[PDB]
Write a protein that binds this ligand. Structure first.
Ligand code: FAD
Ligand code: 3PE
Ligand code: HEM
Ligand code: UMQ
Ligand code: K7G
Ligand code: BOG
Ligand code: OAA
Ligand code: SF4
Ligand code: F3S
Ligand code: FES
Ligand code: K
Lengths: 611, 102, 240, 139
């Protein structure tokens, strides 16, 4: 009933954000015939909304060292980060940012002409003992905008075959290998099968599983959901980052660069309350700590506004010229969406879903991995990078300005790994004559759905269930109440209701597909959250307040009884889903503690985590 | 000329500034010098200005050539008739002043 | 205390043979809706008519997806306040003088291709040290990019220009032209003369007649018309 | 891997042979005084040129010289107000186009491009046009 157009490339990239673009023209740069499949015009991707900047130990403000940045990221990750990936990311960061500037990225400038860098949350000098670092390189507070527009501009020089407004439905799997993807062309309504020896999944996050989020409407975790439908695991999905200062009401992001430039958080009694929660770092502590600090203030009666449900972010003590030069983007946004003049009145803010630490598990080379009987096994022909991937460089909590860096480092890395492992023009692997037909059947059933609950009604019940049961603080009885509700919503997807029976630009259909994608991501999130009986990074259990490592790392390790791998929690969560039932399966895999070179960059053993 | 488009844009403004200064010259120093300068400037400015109209609104190889050809005839006839009026009649400056004495 | 607002929206379905463009009317209780037009489009689509089709993503005015003609002017539906005067119906159209894929979704591929044509990326004569060291740029030369780099390629300006209406095949339009200027005056670019030389024809640049609809309509408050005028001054003074 | 020129051709090739409509434009777009004053600058320019060309054609084809047709008009003894009304109608287009032409040449130097300055200079053009035309027609 549907026409199918078959393509053959050396490689296929799914996503056109910062990470997909870097990978896609990286692959063409290396001679590969590359296809870039994206459901958005590339510069509409959520990367364009990024503000604060991108971290690199350039030393433009003070003497820096990329290993200090390594330490901050490991400590920030709460020792759920893989230290070999963090090593690669943080050592490559100066060259990554310099590449972007050489591409033409219009970085702000210092008196010496070099890239301006601002302070940002939880970044220090001298391995934590030397005070505040200034290594977040930025284009005012429009950094992601400039990064994405520079990469897109750069991409136009190469022979990459773009497939814009194409909606990937599923991977094309054969004998445990990935041979490409199947996608819907939204413009003319045709089904396209992309065959390639290598596929790179760079589909962004899935923040829209929640009611309030800074994420775009298009952040529905489409690539996370294809992996899950392929039978592969997703990693650490229960670690959702709550940014401290999402604007009250609209949830739009107000950058942490506000606090990097001098802004401070104030409660209903005018106390810079971060002086009590983090006496050292204050409003520049890690985001999981700040969001918890703000949330604790609100449920204890010290909330602001008429409803006592948010707090304030004060900037008017800073000079208006600094606010105009360093923060012009959020000055406009605060006026448009909250009527606030940032030179006179504070911004209403509250913790808001912002970024997904979890995602598709990879190694430090970008290659997607699975776990069989205690060993990692690379999936042949399948790669992931960006917020859709779990390298894992961010572990249990991401430092601000490390995501944009993640994008270009591991986007390039996927291109480098394919180029050293394979050659262009090598045989394009064959597929079955009816490969991907299940993707078409599912799309056609949704296209003509005529049940009793429209897509919009089901998307809401999911977002309110996530918001009430997996918020900044979590307990077992609330997480389990939300597990049964969410698994009930998934079973109720059988009674979905659409109206648009067309196939050209059927956003009714596409958003139904995105709801399926969101639901797979949300179940893995809340079920992995319920089983994790500890508190690490953004995941806070009030019925398990302590961090449970393989040792008690507060007291000397001398003669300690080491906890077996099944009796502690310093380990990644691996989640699987039986798509028909919705049943979630959980396993675990160890955290990689070794660096790429211990003589060049010492491994950081777990320690107490305070800011 | 590889700079032909920008040279034409500059020339259009140069003739406009010149036509602008001919108006006070025509009021201050009416005579044959201004009469023939006005005839030349009025035609060139009008010819180029009507060509921008054609460039904006006429499309297709043949309609464009028909329009520009008829414009060129219109302008050549216009410049000739103005020079005729200046040589055989009272000229541009005098005609204006006579018209306003009604 | 409901306040019922009326919207009238352009509709065309390419999957319905013989379908003709019409204007459908919806009634929205502003007491149960966000403040912006896009919030009304989304509420209409979720609750009243799931077939209403339009482009959106960021909902904060940064990605450019949701450009359209609202109350007669090209704007972003997500930064455009709903007119609370219940005695006036808001009319919503696609970007003007564009092929309609469906409902509010225009075809922008010519606009994208024109942007590709001006090579919008940093170019140096010697690109052998690409990636070695950060290029230097004074605070002053970087300030010259303010007002230029912030463009979000929404196409509100170009689709408001009558010259782009009549000669969109050959006139590059104010969005693309201002991006050409953003690279011409980047102190790090070595192809200024080459980028000016590209515009030596009657159409690419010189169809602009200073109508200034582009600057009036830009939702980011930018001035492509002044950028075009600065290009024209450079065209007239550069020596090969 | 298509070039920009190739993409342009494919755009036109597929849209003109499609069933897609063209989004409305003139019938729906909101008017403004700058847009109206730009249309009026073209109307007055075209009208002046067509008048200049009709004059030169009359000079080549009419069997009587200019002073004859002036004496004819003077002998009709038309009213002062109608003479004034005819003089206003002839000088208004030249007046508008001249002042707004100066505005254009100011723009071509790169001055006055702030949207609020565009509106100021336009209203100034309107009152100078009206003051100059009433002054000149009264002559
Ligand atoms: C939300 C946000 C995030 C953010 C930020 C500000 C905001 C408002 N500021 C940041 C900052 O200052 N510094 C930083 O390090 N990070 C910041 N972030 C986080 C970061 O921006 C994002 O996590 C990151 O940009 C994600 O980039 P990525 O390339 O991984 O993904 P994306 O940009 O969201 O784009 C997703 C792409 O995938 C394509 N896609 C998705 N589904 C499909 C299907 N089904 N078919 C085809 N293509 C698909 C989309 O087209 C999109 O291009
Ligand atoms: C549609 C229009 C189509 C035609 C387009 C015309 C474009 C060309 C314009 C040429 C301008 C030439 C200016 C001539 C200057 C001149 O010699 O004018 C003298 C005239 C006498 O004035 P004066 O003696 O001071 O009398 C005062 C009142 N008793 O002083 C005047 O009365 C000046 C009157 C100027 C009115 C111009 C109107 C042109 C129509
Ligand atoms: C006697 C005059 C005649 C017959 C005349 C005729 C014209 C015509 C036909 C146009 C083209 C209209 C368009 O392209 O929109 C034009 C444009 C123009 N005129 Fe005149 N004009 C006269 C006097 C003047 C004066 C005194 C000035 C000063 C002037 C300045 C301009 C300018 C700057 C333009 C450019 C319009 C643009 O850039 O789009 N003109 N004129
Ligand atoms: C012969 C004389 C020839 C010229 C006469 C032209 C007469 C027609 C003018 C039509 C003007 O139409 C009207 O213009 C005004 C002023 O620009 C517009 O005004 C709008 O833009 C201005 C400028 O930023 C804003 O300050 C103002 O608050 C807003 O309402 C209004 O939206 C439009 O409805
Ligand atoms: N200025 C303008 C314009 C022109 O042709 C125009 C004028 C002067 C110079 C060059 C041009 Cl190209 C037009 N404007 C409109 C219009 C009508 C209704 C609503 C909005 C715009 C139709 S033509
Ligand atoms: C000042 C005199 C203006 C005369 C305009 C005459 C009508 C033009 O006609 C129109 O021109 C448009 C392009 O401009 C085309 O898009 C239309 O298809 C065509 O019908
Ligand atoms: O998430 C990040 O990396 C940074 C961010 O949102 C900000 O600018 O505040
Ligand atoms: S100049 Fe303004 S209206 Fe035009 S594309 Fe850029 S942001 Fe959009
Ligand atoms: S509206 Fe158009 S004519 Fe020029 S000044 Fe703007 S590009
Ligand atoms: S949705 Fe991104 S600009 Fe309106
Ligand atoms: K991730």
């Amino acid at each position: 009933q549907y026409p199918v157009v078959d393509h053959e490339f050396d490689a296929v990239v799914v996503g056109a954000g910062g990470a997909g673009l870097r990978a896609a023209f990286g692959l063409s740069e290396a001679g590969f015939n590359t296809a870039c499949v994206t459901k958005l015009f590339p510069t509409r991707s959520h990367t364009v909304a990024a503000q604060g900047g991108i971290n690199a130990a350039l030393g433009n403000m003070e003497d820096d060292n990329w290993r200090w940045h390594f330490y901050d990221t490991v400590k920030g990750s709460d020792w759920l980060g893989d230290q070999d990936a963090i090593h690669y990311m943080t050592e490559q960061a100066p060259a990554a940012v310099i590449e972007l500037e050489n591409y033409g990225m219009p970085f702000s400038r210092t008196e010496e002409g070099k890239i301006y860098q601002r302070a940002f949350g939880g970044q220090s000098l001298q391995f934590g003992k030397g005070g505040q670092a200034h290594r977040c390189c930025c284009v005012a507070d429009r950094t992601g905008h400039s990064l994405l527009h520079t990469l897109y501009g750069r991409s136009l020089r190469y022979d990459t075959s773009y497939f814009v407004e194409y909606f990937a439905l599923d991977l094309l799997m054969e004998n445990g290998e990935c041979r490409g993807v199947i996608a819907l062309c939204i413009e003319d309504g045709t089904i396209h099968r992309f065959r390639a020896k290598n596929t790179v999944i760079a589909t962004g996050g899935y923040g829209r599983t929640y009611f309030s989020c800074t994420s775009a409407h298009t952040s529905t975790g489409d690539g996370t959901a294809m992996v899950t439908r392929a039978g592969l695991p997703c990693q650490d999905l229960e670690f959702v980052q709550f940014h401290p200062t999402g604007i009250y009401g609209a949830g739009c992001l107000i950058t942490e660069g506000c606090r990097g430039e001098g802004g401070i958080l104030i409660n209903s009694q005018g106390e810079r309350f971060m002086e009590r929660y983090a006496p050292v770092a204050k409003d520049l502590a890690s985001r999981d700590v700040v969001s918890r600090s703000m949330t604790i203030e609100i449920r204890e009666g010290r909330g602001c506004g008429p409803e006592k449900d948010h707090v304030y972010l004060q900037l008017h003590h800073l000079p208006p010229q600094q606010l105009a030069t360093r923060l012009p983007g959020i000055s406009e946004t605060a006026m448009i969406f909250a009527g606030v003049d940032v030179t006179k009145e504070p911004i209403p803010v509250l913790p808001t879903v912002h970024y997904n630490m979890g995602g598709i598990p990879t190694n430090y080379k970008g290659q997607v991995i699975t776990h069989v009987n205690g060993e990692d096994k690379v999936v042949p022909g399948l790669y992931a990078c960006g917020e859709a991937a779990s390298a894992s460089v961010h572990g249990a909590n991401r430092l601000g300005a490390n995501s944009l860096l993640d994008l270009v480092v591991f986007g390039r890395a996927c291109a480098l790994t394919i180029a050293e492992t394979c050659k262009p023009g090598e045989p394009v692997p064959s597929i079955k004559p009816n490969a991907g037909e299940e993707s078409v059947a599912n799309l056609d059933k949704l296209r003509f759905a005529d049940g009793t609950i429209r897509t919009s009604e089901a998307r809401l019940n999911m977002q309110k269930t996530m918001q009430s049961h997996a918020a900044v603080f979590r307990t077992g009885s609330i997480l389990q109440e939300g597990c049964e509700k969410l698994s009930q919503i998934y079973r109720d997807l059988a009674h979905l209701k659409t109206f648009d029976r067309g196939i050209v630009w059927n956003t009714d259909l596409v958003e139904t597909l995105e709801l399926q994608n969101l639901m797979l991501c949300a179940l893995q999130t809340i079920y992995g959250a319920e089983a994790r009986k500890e508190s690490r990074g953004a995941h806070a259990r009030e019925d398990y307040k302590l961090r449970i490592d393989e040792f008690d790392y507060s007291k000397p390790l001398q003669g300690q009884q080491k906890r077996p791998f099944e009796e502690h929690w310093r380990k990644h969560t691996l989640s699987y889903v039986d798509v028909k039932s919705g049943k979630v399966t959980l396993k675990y895999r160890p955290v990689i503690d070794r660096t790429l070179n211990e003589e060049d960059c010492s491994s950081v053993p777990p320690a107490i985590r305070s800011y | 000329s590889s700079k032909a488009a920008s040279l034409h844009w500059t020339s259009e403004r140069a003739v406009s500034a010149l036509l602008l200064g001919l108006l006070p010259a025509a009021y201050l120093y009416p005579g044959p010098a201004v009469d023939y300068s006005l005839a030349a400037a009025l035609t060139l400015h009008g010819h180029w200005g009507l060509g921008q109209v054609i460039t904006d609104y006429v499309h297709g190889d043949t309609p464009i050539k028909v329009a520009n050809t008829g414009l060129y005839v219109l302008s050549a006839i216009t410049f000739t008739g103005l020079c005729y009026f200046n040589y055989y009649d009272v000229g541009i400056c005098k005609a204006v002043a006579m018209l306003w004495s009604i | 205390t409901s306040r019922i607002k009326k919207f009238s929206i352009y509709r065309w379905d390419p999957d319905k043979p013989g379908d003709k463009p019409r204007m459908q009317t919806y009634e929205v209780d502003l007491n149960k809706c966000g403040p912006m037009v896009l919030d009304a489009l989304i509420k209409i689509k979720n609750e009243l008519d799931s077939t209403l089709t339009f482009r959106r993503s960021c909902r904060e005015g940064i990605c450019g997806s949701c450009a359209m003609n609202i109350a007669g002017g090209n704007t972003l539906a997500c930064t455009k306040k709903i007119d609370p005067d219940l005695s006036k119906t808001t009319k919503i159209y696609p970007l003007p003088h564009m092929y309609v894929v469906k409902d509010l979704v225009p075809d922008l591929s010519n606009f994208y291709a024109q942007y590709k044509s001006i090579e919008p990326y940093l170019k140096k004569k010697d690109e052998s040290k690409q990636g070695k060291e950060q290029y230097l740029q004074s605070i002053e030369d970087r300030q010259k990019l303010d007002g230029l780099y912030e463009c979000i390629l929404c196409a509100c300006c170009s689709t408001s220009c009558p010259s782009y209406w009549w000669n969109g095949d050959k006139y590059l339009g104010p969005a693309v032209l201002m991006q050409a200027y953003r690279w011409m005056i980047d102190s790090r670019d070595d192809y200024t003369e080459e980028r000016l030389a590209q515009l030596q024809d009657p159409f690419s640049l010189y169809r602009c007649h200073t109508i200034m609809n582009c600057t009036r309509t830009c939702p980011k408050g930018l001035n492509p018309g002044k950028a075009i005028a600065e290009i024209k001054k450079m065209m007239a003074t550069y020596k090969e | 891997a298509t070039t920009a020129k190739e993409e342009m051709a494919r755009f036109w090739e597929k849209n003109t042979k499609s069933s897609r409509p063209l989004s409305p434009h003139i019938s729906i777009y909101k008017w403004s005084l700058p847009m109206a004053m730009s249309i009026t600058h073209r109307g007055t320019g075209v009208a002046l040129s067509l008048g200049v060309s009709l004059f030169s054609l009359a000079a080549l084809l009419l069997p009587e010289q200019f002073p004859h047709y002036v004496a004819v008009v003077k002998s009709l003894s038309l009213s002062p107000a109608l003479i004034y009304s005819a003089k206003f109608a002839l000088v208004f287009p030249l007046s508008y186009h001249t002042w707004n032409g100066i505005r254009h040449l100011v723009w071509d130097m790169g001055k006055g491009f702030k949207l609020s300055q565009v509106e100021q200079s336009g209203v100034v053009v309107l009152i100078l046009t009206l003051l100059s035309s009433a002054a000149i027609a009264a002559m």
